[PDB]
Amino acid sequence: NQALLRILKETEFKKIKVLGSGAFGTVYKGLWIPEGEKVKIPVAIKELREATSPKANKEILDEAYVMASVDNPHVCRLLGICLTSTVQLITQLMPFGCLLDYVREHKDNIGSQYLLNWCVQIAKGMNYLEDRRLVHRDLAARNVLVKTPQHVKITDFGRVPIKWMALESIIYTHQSDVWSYGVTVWELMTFGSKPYDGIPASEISSILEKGERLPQPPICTIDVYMIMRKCWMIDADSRPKFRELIIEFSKMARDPQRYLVIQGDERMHLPSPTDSNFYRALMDEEDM
Amino acid sequence: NQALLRILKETEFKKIKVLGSGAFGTVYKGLWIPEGEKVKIPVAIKELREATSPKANKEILDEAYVMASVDNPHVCRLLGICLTSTVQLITQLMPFGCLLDYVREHKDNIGSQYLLNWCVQIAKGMNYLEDRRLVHRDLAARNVLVKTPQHVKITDFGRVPIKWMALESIIYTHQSDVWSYGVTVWELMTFGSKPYDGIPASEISSILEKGERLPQPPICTIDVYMIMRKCWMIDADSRPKFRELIIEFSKMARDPQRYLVIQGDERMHLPSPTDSNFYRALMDEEDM
Numbered sequence: 206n207q208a209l210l211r212i213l214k215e216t217e218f219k220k221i222k223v224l225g226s227g228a229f230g231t232v233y234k235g236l237w238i239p240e241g242e243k244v245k246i247p248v249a250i251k252e253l254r255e256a257t258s259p260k261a262n263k264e265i266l267d268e269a270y271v272m273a274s275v276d277n278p279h280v281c282r283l284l285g286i287c288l289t290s291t292v293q294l295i296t297q298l299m300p301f302g303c304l305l306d307y308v309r310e311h312k313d314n315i316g317s318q319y320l321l322n323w324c325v326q327i328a329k330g331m332n333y334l335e336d337r338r339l340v341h342r343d344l345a346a347r348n349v350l351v352k353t354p355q356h357v358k359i360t361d362f363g364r365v366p367i368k369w370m371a372l373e374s375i376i377y378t379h380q381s382d383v384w385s386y387g388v389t390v391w392e393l394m395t396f397g398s399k400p401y402d403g404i405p406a407s408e409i410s411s412i413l414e415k416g417e418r419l420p421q422p423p424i425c426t427i428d429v430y431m432i433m434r435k436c437w438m439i440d441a442d443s444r445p446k447f448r449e450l451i452i453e454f455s456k457m458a459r460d461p462q463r464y465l466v467i468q469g470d471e472r473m474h475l476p477s478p479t480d481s482n483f484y485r486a487l488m489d490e491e492d493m
Numbered sequence: 494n495q496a497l498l499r500i501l502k503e504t505e506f507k508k509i510k511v512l513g514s515g516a517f518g519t520v521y522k523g524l525w526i527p528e529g530e531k532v533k534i535p536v537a538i539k540e541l542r543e544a545t546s547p548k549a550n551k552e553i554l555d556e557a558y559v560m561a562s563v564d565n566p567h568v569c570r571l572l573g574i575c576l577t578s579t580v581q582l583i584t585q586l587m588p589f590g591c592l593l594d595y596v597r598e599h600k601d602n603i604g605s606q607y608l609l610n611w612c613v614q615i616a617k618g619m620n621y622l623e624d625r626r627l628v629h630r631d632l633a634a635r636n637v638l639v640k641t642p643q644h645v646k647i648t649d650f651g652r653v654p655i656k657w658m659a660l661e662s663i664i665y666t667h668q669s670d671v672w673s674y675g676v677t678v679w680e681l682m683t684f685g686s687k688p689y690d691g692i693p694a695s696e697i698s699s700i701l702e703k704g705e706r707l708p709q710p711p712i713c714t715i716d717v718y719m720i721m722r723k724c725w726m727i728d729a730d731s732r733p734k735f736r737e738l739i740i741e742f743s744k745m746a747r748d749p750q751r752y753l754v755i756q757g758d759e760r761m762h763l764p765s766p767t768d769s770n771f772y773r774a775l776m777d778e779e780d781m
């Protein structure tokens with residue numbers, strides 16, 4: 206339990222390159238140098254843009270131990286922490302970056318089988334988080350990291366993203382996460398489009414009350430767009446459960462081209478078991 | 494089966510830094526760039542110092558598929574290959590380097606619990622290789638790679654190292670590997686000493702026939718030096734099996750200071766479950 210979150214010294218890791226920033230901190234690629242060792246281990250380091258107090262660190266630690274406790278192939282685990290003036294959090298470095306940026310830069314080489322499997326994997330991770338009774342509160346294509354193209358994990362859970370929140374959050378339940386899951390799915394199926402592009406956030410809750418939802422992405426059949434609309438029902442309990450989302454997106458993943466119309470989908474593919482085994486043993490030794 | 498050894502193009506990986514060389518090839522740290530992807534994945538690349546023919550590549554591939562087929566936490570798996578004029582082999586990059594260099598550079602911070610566990614892990618991997626009916630033929634502290642300080646794996650098996658070979662090899666059986674295991678153990682317990690230092694290789698088989706073995710390392714009790722001597726029996730079948738080596742070195746690992754006398758052993762230690770979990774999730778996601 207307590208053994209799941211390593212407390213680090215400043216002197217045993219170094220931030221070497223910035224990777225990006227959110228409205229909570231800045232993310233660096235970093236090197237972890239174990240005491241007495243001559244090696245340099247690449248890590249990801251989030252340093253909060255908000256310097257803290259020692260009593261406030263008691264809040265941070267109380268949640269950090271929980272996020273260090275997740276054990277699921279499609280959920281990122283918080284690994285370490287260094288409680289400087291500004292707190293730094295450490296996790297596994299994902300060289301493929303987030304899924305949002307990934308789809309935007311590969312939108313012309315992304316097939317139906319990859320898209321659909323990603324929706325399954327993200328759902329498995331949300332279903333795990335629900336079984337641990339952890340509400341994500343910030344699910345987005347930006348907070349889905351790519352370990353390998355075949356393997357995605359969910360990050361930055363358990364901590365406003367108005368365009369991703371349920372109407373009752375603009376209340377955070379697992380059913381409110383289901384909403385954010387639908388928005389994440391829409392981001393993938395639109396190859397990274399910005400939801401409600403150009404509409405100011407202060408006015409999203411208005412358009413949701415009048416019945417407007419995100420439009421059907423061009424590559425979605427009705428079976429896929431039905432699911433996304435169901436995630437955006439005003440009644441939270443009427444939304445589909447994550448356990449069900451797994452079942453339906455797995456069904457569609459065994460016949461992908463039936464449920465996603467993508468130009469050049471017979472050229473786009475999935476890696477031969479030859480390429481997957483080479484992927485996993487180099488970067489992704491997790492079971493799966 | 495065939496899906497366990499990825500064939501690579503030249504254009505999808507690059508050698509960026511040399512790491513060392515043996516009398517068979519040169520090892521580089523390399524970057525694997527997946528087709529269509531914008532990331533750079535660190536790998537290890539062995540390029541043979543011997544340019545080959547296409548029919549000779551049929552030999553190489555026939556063995557490479559076997560080495561790509563090992564599934565054991567303490568055995569390195571061959572992952573890929575690029576069959577240029579000089580063949581390049583690819584495997585997971587171990588930033589901690591080999592165990593030989595590791596012990597030499599940490600000899601003043603290495604305790605009995607680490608040394609003994611390493612002997613267990615190396616034995617587990619040799620016991621696996623015996624169960625797959627693969628003779629190592631070049632077991633040494635140089636060919637034991639450090640994934641993390643707590644986790645070592647055996648490399649470069651299944652391909653002369655006179656000072657590591659059994660007398661009947663100077664015949665390669667699993668019992669001849671047991672000999673090389675004893676020599677590997679002696680290398681660790683001597684914090685990286687060179688076996689038979691200063692004695693020319695052409696004259697090692699002579700000294701072995703007259704009964705000379707490696708000396709008892711200063712930190713070994715008799716129980717440990719008894720095992721090492723048993724690995725060097727002239728009768729191969731009289732040597733202990735790897736299955737037994739596991740049992741005896743595990744026994745000694747539950748009471749390490751009873752079997753290894755190391756100055757400052759109460760200061761040297763093992764990482765708290767806090768530090769191990771941080772190690773594994775960053776670098777070593779294998780089960781164990």
Ligand SMILES: CN1CCC(c2ccc(-c3ccc4c(c3)C(=O)N([C@@H](C(=O)Nc3nccs3)c3cc(F)ccc3O)C4)cc2)CC1
Nearest residue numbers: 232249250251261265269272281282283294295296361362
């Ligand atoms: C300021 N005033 C006083 C103090 C209060 C406060 C309460 C809690 C935190 C806290 C604690 C723990 C975390 C986070 C935040 C967080 O953002 N965390 C991510 C994560 O670290 N991401 C990464 N990117 C790259 C490298 S590390 C994360 C990673 C992961 F693998 C799984 C879940 C997860 O949440 C972990 C901070 C401040 C707030 C109000």
Ligand SMILES: CN1CCC(c2ccc(-c3ccc4c(c3)C(=O)N([C@@H](C(=O)Nc3nccs3)c3cc(F)ccc3O)C4)cc2)CC1
Nearest residue numbers: 520537538539549553557560569570571582583584649650
């Ligand atoms: C020249 N004339 C004609 C041709 C004949 C020939 C026959 C077989 C090979 C062959 C095939 C396969 C391998 C090896 C050698 C080998 O050296 N291999 C290691 C390995 O690649 N190490 C690494 N270091 C860093 C990056 S890759 C290795 C790695 C591992 F993870 C597990 C086992 C293993 O053996 C694999 C070459 C030539 C010989 C005589």
Ligand SMILES: Nc1ncnc2c1ncn2[C@@H]1O[C@H](COP(=O)(O)OP(=O)(O)NP(=O)(O)O)[C@@H](O)[C@H]1O
Nearest residue numbers: 224225226227228232249297298299302303347361
């Ligand atoms: N483990 C990781 N490995 C590599 N890059 C990462 C990792 N975690 C986050 N990033 C990237 O670091 C950048 C900053 O992340 P972050 O601070 O979380 O902002 P954000 O995810 O875009 N918005 P938010 O997470 O909702 O605050 C993004 O481009 C992420 O993809």
Ligand SMILES: Nc1ncnc2c1ncn2[C@@H]1O[C@H](COP(=O)(O)OP(=O)(O)NP(=O)(O)O)[C@@H](O)[C@H]1O
Nearest residue numbers: 512513514515516520537585586587590591635649
């Ligand atoms: N996977 C790996 N990751 C990092 N370094 C490695 C890896 N495999 C080998 N090395 C290192 O690369 C260097 C060259 O290795 P190698 O070519 O095997 O020579 P050697 O092991 O010292 N002698 P030999 O293996 O018996 O031919 C050594 O310093 C090894 O520790």
Ligand SMILES: [Mg+2]
Nearest residue numbers: 227347348361
């Ligand atoms: Mg993020």
Ligand SMILES: [Mg+2]
Nearest residue numbers: 515635636649
């Ligand atoms: Mg070697």
